[PDB]
Amino acid sequence: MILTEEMQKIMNLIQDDENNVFVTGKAGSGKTTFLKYLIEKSGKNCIVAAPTGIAAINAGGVTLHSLFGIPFGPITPYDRLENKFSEYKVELLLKMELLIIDEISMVRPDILDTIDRKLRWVYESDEPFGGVQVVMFGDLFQLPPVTKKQEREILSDFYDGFFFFNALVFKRTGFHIVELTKIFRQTEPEFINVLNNIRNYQVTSDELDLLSELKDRKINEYIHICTHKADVEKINADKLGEQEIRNYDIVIKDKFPESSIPCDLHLKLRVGARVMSLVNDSLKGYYNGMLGIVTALEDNVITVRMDNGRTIKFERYTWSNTEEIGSCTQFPLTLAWAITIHKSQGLTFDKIIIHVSHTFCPGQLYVALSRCRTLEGIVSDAFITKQMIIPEYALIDFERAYKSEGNYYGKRL
Amino acid sequence: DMILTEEMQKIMNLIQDDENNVFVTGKAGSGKTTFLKYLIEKSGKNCIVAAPTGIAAINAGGVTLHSLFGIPFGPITPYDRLENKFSEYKVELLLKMELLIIDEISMVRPDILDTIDRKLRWVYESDEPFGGVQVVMFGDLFQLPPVTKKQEREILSDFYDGFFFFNALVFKRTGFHIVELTKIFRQTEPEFINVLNNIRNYQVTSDELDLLSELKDRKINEYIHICTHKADVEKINADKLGEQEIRNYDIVIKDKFPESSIPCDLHLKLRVGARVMSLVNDSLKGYYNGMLGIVTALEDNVITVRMDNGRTIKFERYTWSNTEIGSCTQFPLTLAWAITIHKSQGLTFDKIIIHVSHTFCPGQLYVALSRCRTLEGIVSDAFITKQMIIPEYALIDFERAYKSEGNYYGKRL
Amino acid sequence: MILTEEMQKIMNLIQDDENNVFVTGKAGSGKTTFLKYLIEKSGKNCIVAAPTGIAAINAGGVTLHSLFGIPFGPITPYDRLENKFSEYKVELLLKMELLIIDEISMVRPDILDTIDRKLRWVYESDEPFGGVQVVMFGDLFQLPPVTKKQEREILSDFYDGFFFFNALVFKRTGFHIVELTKIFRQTEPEFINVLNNIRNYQVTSDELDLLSELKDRKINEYIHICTHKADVEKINADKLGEQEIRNYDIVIKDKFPESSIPCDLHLKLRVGARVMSLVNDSLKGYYNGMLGIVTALEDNVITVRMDNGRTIKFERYTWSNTEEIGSCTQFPLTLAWAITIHKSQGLTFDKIIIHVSHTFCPGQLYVALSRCRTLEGIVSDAFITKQMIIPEYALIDFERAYKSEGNYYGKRL
Amino acid sequence: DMILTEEMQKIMNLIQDDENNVFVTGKAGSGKTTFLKYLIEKSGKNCIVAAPTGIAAINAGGVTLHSLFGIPFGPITPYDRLENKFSEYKVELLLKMELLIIDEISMVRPDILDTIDRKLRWVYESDEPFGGVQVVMFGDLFQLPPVTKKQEREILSDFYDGFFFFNALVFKRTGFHIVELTKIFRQTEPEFINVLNNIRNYQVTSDELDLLSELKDRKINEYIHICTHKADVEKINADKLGEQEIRNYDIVIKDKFPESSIPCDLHLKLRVGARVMSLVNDSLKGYYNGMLGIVTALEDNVITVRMDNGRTIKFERYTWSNTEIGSCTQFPLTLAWAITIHKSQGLTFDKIIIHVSHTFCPGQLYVALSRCRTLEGIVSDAFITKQMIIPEYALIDFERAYKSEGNYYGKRL
DNA sequence: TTTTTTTCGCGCGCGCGTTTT
DNA sequence: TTTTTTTCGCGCGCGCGTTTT
Ligand SMILES: Nc1ncnc2c1ncn2[C@@H]1O[C@H](COP(=O)(O)OP(=O)(O)O)[C@@H](O)[C@H]1O
Ligand SMILES: Nc1ncnc2c1ncn2[C@@H]1O[C@H](COP(=O)(O)OP(=O)(O)O)[C@@H](O)[C@H]1O
Ligand SMILES: Nc1ncnc2c1ncn2[C@@H]1O[C@H](COP(=O)(O)OP(=O)(O)O)[C@@H](O)[C@H]1O
Ligand SMILES: Nc1ncnc2c1ncn2[C@@H]1O[C@H](COP(=O)(O)OP(=O)(O)O)[C@@H](O)[C@H]1O
Ligand code: ALF
Ligand code: ALF
Ligand code: ALF
Ligand code: ALF
Ligand SMILES: [Mg+2]
Ligand SMILES: [Mg+2]
Ligand SMILES: [Mg+2]
Ligand SMILES: [Mg+2]
């Protein structure tokens, strides 16, 4: 691992200055690698979180929703929060000196405000975030936070936009913006060039021509990633096959809409199947997004050898729909040869097959291509076109604002 | 017919070097207390044996820590003044001692160990930890933890990072090796052992617990009743006592003595043939806290009991002091067909009836089940469930720390 | 009031000797008058009770069932008692030094044993009645305790008879028997003579001839008393009339057999109606058996001027049938021109009309006649015959036993 | 326009004889505190005024008993040693005093009066009760009783037959007359008064309580909120405070000071116009415990308040001691739109909102309702029921005792 | 069109509401 | 066929289980 001069300056900033900091940079600029270095070398008590389970594991932490007990759905400044933290969690949050959030680009502003409110409650303080110093890592030109149209309508009454920096807490505090400008994941200068111009919406037809060889390229080592969950399910079912399959049915109890069920209705597995854990269970040593391989199937237990070498015996898990109207019980596992691009953000691969024939988020195409260390390792189902790129001009405005104002956003303290 | 294993031999040879403290640990029934007695018999050192409970002390051949070291009740801080009122007999015994042996260390508070450190340094007029005495601790942190109330923990929390023996402040100035015995002797059934072990470490599954389904209401005075709660113990003892030929002995209280602080029975009810336990130590008369016997005669002021160890003892009334404001006088005996799980820790039985429908301590269910040599010898009032298992995550942290640092904890010398 | 030599000897016995005492004597021998004197002059803390509400008021106390929280129905030595005493009641019973029970002849043995068990519970003692000294007043040749045939069958498995002295506590303790032999209520020697021979079953036809003038004697001052509740209801309804009547209906909620309802189904009242309270409410100043006159009737309040001068506003009361299956709500009042002979025991009147054409209890005829200060004040509906007298030969045996054994019954201490 | 009644004149003339203590009592709003001020104005005696609560003391023109006599918290037994640390100013004031005036005596513990007795006898170097000072007590035993926890009562129960002021041991060596004021002035509606009176003495009926049906959710900053619970007070105060232009002042705690022992606000939140109350006495600066005012300015270290009495005061931070182990520093102010019923006792209002859905003290409901001059001025959150009434039977006994013994209690001199 | 929580538990006890230099 | 109970209450907190000369 190489410690660059940019990284050294940021280390010294964080040690000398308690202000919040946004550490940003293009795909594969070493942000998560540097995150882990910062903690190891800092003398501070650090807690690591991320918006998705996979990204959290990649950073060595847990989801924001788990750490802070955050409910699903949009949270307005007038909603009352249930403060039901255990004493271990209160103590952990009080002991914490540095809150580290990775992949900040996918964090909603009301999530950050909920964290602010919950930390101020835990600390019994009026200081933003309870006085904890916050260091955020990510790339706003990758995927934005997941919001449904109805949620955006509710939030639009209080928020001028749907990115983390729109949080109301940044009227009372702010952060420096620093950037890492050396690419490490890729080494080919022309591949990097097209990536960068996709990222900032300034790619030309001629530059995208470099990627013509991706589509239907002639070749279990290749990882599939898809824009759509429906595509993920088809690819996973194909790779699963019909040899030696066991089926495990969900048990639903009372109210539980089918579109709200967090798990598989009919979990179909075989020995050798690539799977992902859906839930966190620190007692059993597994966490949301951890990957492994099924090694045995029984009546009430599924055995999976995790990538980290641990063998785990999974039992069924019970979700609540809330006030407990209905519940559902099922093994917390799902097939995982294919994954969404949203879940892929943060990971690195040598060989990938991307399914981007229909993109619908800013940054989605950019994230998909930038997972791979080399150009030759990408296969595509479709020619790469400018129509796959969706600009978000509110991000141009944001960067223009802080870059012309001393690389700082929000209330100066 | 006592097997000396290779693990036991290595520990003997380790201890030879009178400069490194050692924690000898291992699962229930791995021969820990058996090996303690071997170490002493074969060592050339002057050894003293102690344990936190009277039953465990007798089982190890020693006395309670509170009796040996004159320890008061309630939390002791490093700033509390200790009464150093040892007789010359006791001072001489402690000066002659070369090896302090503590069994069932898991139930020893950290402030208890520090009080022992302070008292031994006073006796030895030394600044060396424990007065220079070598300390060998025996037990299993995954059995019952020390009994503490929330208020006592609150006082201690200003000085201690946790409430286990290894949190003692003396282990900033000294430390100990950790060694383990990994062969189970008490049980012989491999599948029974596997369920015990997986209950112990919080990773038992529903399917494994199905092995224990036959415990509840199993069809069969040979069975020993072991209960989570003292109130249940009292009910079972009164049933077995019956109403035939009962004699009652009332406590005499003199002045101030809260009823919740009385150490003995308020109304001691006995008959010839009753199974009883001594509550106090009187080495001159040959009886000790936790010793078991059978009532052979009842008189106005004398109860004759033939002890299990073959001695016949004539018990008279004993006088406790509450400090001197008030006192209470009563025979130091109590019924003992039934006992608490806390009192059972350390003992072995062939046939038991366990009352674990309500467990409230980590390790409580594990201790209860692991007393019995065979599965068939256990009867339960309730199905055994995961809700009976209570994790103590401070123990996971502790084992992770010492296992990665050479099986040693505390200040390296 | 005259203090006789018999009374003086009993006073000195009770002061010098903590043994229990049965104070007995014929009707109108001053027992209840002397009871009140004993308390006034004793230095002991005394509590007064009686089996019926009227008798309790006459003695200045409360019913045994209320004082000790006794359920209805027979209580066997194997039934478990609910010990649900308030702290005031526990303290009152602990403060009590002398338990005084009037009209003991109507107290069942299992009631006394329940009191024994409850007092031993309150005092945490094995001494009979918790060590309290018990002084009982009454006349075994008056009415016996009320028992139904089914209750007698249950009790006959444990009890050799159905009088208070058959209680099992009198195998562990006993009492002196003393007697008052001077009649005060009546002054006519020949009236006294016939009363006495009715009482002891040795009246002759010629002696009963003295009472011939009672039947249909030519004359609101006369009080009616009846053997049967049905007769009481008819006489009360006659005297109530149909002028200016208001009706108040019971509200029954769920399970409540009509033969188990403690109150009136359709309470019919008018201003001027003679009524009796059915329940105790010390807060409002009224108690079971207290007598008064209705002064006003409203929608939800009935106003009664009690004999003691207090004006009371009665609201509806709610009984429980038990575990609360059903309940009933009603004003705790009932008409009371007529009363049963059982309720009359203990009271004195100048003028009475007795309805004894059908008697069914030993002592019933004797109690009815002996309420009146003079012979001329009695009117009867029927000629007085030997068939109205029902001997209980178990009482002859009892008196023979104690009179020949030093006027003591039970275990001598 | 203050009416001097014949009852008041007789009490004035009674007191003239400086050798008989007097208890002046009467129902809520009978002019007791008004007459107190008259007695002093017209008496030629040197009078000192005190009360158990700060609000009541201000209402009577005096100071708290704890401040006047330097009384520690917690129960004081006759064997506890008192710190007699009075300044010469205080000693001289107490020596000059001729009449000790105590208002709201119902909330005064008996051990408090004995501490005052002991301290005055020390100051006067005398064995005469209260040092020979004449004591006149004002209050209503059917309002709130003194605040005691069960543990404090347990300690005191070894020496005291009850927990009201008249149980003080000094009343074995002295006594007092009881006089009463029986004309209500605060209210004028006879039917409203009748319901107040019948709630007060535990004899209100359902039909009488029907008069109060219109209280619940009555349609209307003029209304004062009075609550049973401090937690409710805090909620109402925060609502009225709002979130416009709020300044927060945090407590500074230094070392040992349990959070449940802090006398002030942890986070004092204020704005200009906020209704506040002083928490401490500083006679030099002209403010006293319970004095009410309005915030006029907020600064870093100074809050300017125009008091109700016309004085403008500049409050600085105050330092409490916990004994010296730890201390806490904070402005001695708290919001006071809402107040507890305990703090309201003694005050009069035209318009109130009472929160009595959960009452837990005798007299609490009565005090709440009786603050208001008219029925229409009361709004309630709940229907008024008999379950809100809590009898204290020790008061019935007390009134029975003194009323039958010449309206005098204690040792007659 | 895309993602995302929560460390054991039944039961009795009794606080609640006040107050210093 | 005849007589006879029980003094406020919702809610949070946390014990439980141990131990001297
Ligand atoms: N300082 C570095 N030295 C060497 N290789 C690096 C360095 N930083 C990143 N890399 C490589 O590039 C990859 C990018 O890591 P990561 O921080 O997860 O991506 P991003 O920079 O987009 O957050 C790493 O997996 C690593 O292989
Ligand atoms: N080396 C050995 N050979 C034979 N039996 C043994 C050996 N070690 C222990 N045991 C048996 O295993 C059981 C465990 O008893 P004990 O040592 O008191 O509990 P623990 O091992 O949990 O301290 C005892 O019955 C003992 O006889
Ligand atoms: N010692 C006495 N002196 C005068 N009159 C008495 C005396 N004892 C009883 N009486 C009269 O006789 C009546 C009997 O009283 P009581 O004791 O109730 O009846 P009993 O003696 O049957 O219990 C009293 O009401 C009273 O009028
Ligand atoms: N003699 C009087 N004449 C006129 N008003 C009076 C008289 N006595 C009391 N009041 C009024 O009755 C109300 C009762 O107030 P206060 O005396 O403080 O309460 P309490 O009487 O309960 O001590 C006050 O508003 C007071 O003005
Ligand atoms: F954090 Al990245 F690609 F932006 F792994
Ligand atoms: F650890 Al053991 F009996 F001493 F299980
Ligand atoms: F007690 Al009676 F007649 F026997 F009044
Ligand atoms: F007794 Al008051 F206001 F002083 F009701
Ligand atoms: Mg990253
Ligand atoms: Mg052992
Ligand atoms: Mg009588
Ligand atoms: Mg007043």
Author numbering:
A (entry chain A), C (entry chain A): 4 to 222, 228 to 330, 342 to 432
B (entry chain B), D (entry chain B): 3 to 222, 228 to 330, 343 to 432
Text taken from the publication that reported this structure:
Helicases are modular motor proteins that couple the binding and hydrolysis of ATP to unwinding of double-stranded (ds) DNA and play essential roles in nearly all aspects of nucleic acid metabolism, ranging from DNA replication to chromatin remodeling. Pif1 unwinds duplex DNA in a single-base-pair kinetic step, powered by the hydrolysis of one ATP molecule. To reveal the structural basis for unwinding dsDNA by Pif1, we determined the structure of BaPif1 in complex with a symmetrical dual forked dsDNA and ADP·AlF4−.
The structure of BaPif1–10dT-fdsDNA showed that two BaPif1 molecules bind to each fork of 10dT-dsDNA and interact with their respective forks in the same manner. The binding of BaPif1 to the 5′ arm causes a sharp bend between T10 and C11; consequently, the base of T10 points in the direction opposite to those of other oligo-dTs. Importantly, the bending in the 5′ ss/dsDNA junction breaks the first C11–G20 base-pair. BaPif1 bound to the 5′ arm uses loops β11–β12, β12–β13 and β14 of the 2B domain to interact with loop α8–α9, helices α9 and α13 of the 2A domain in the BaPif1 bound to the 3′ ss/dsDNA junction predominantly through a network of salt bridge contacts and hydrogen bonds. First, the BaPif1 molecule bound to the 5′ arm initiates the forked DNA unwinding by breaking the first base-pair through geometrical strain while the BaPif1 molecule bound to the 3′ arm plays an accessory role in unwinding through stabilizing the first broken base-pair and engaging the second base-pair in a pre-breaking state.
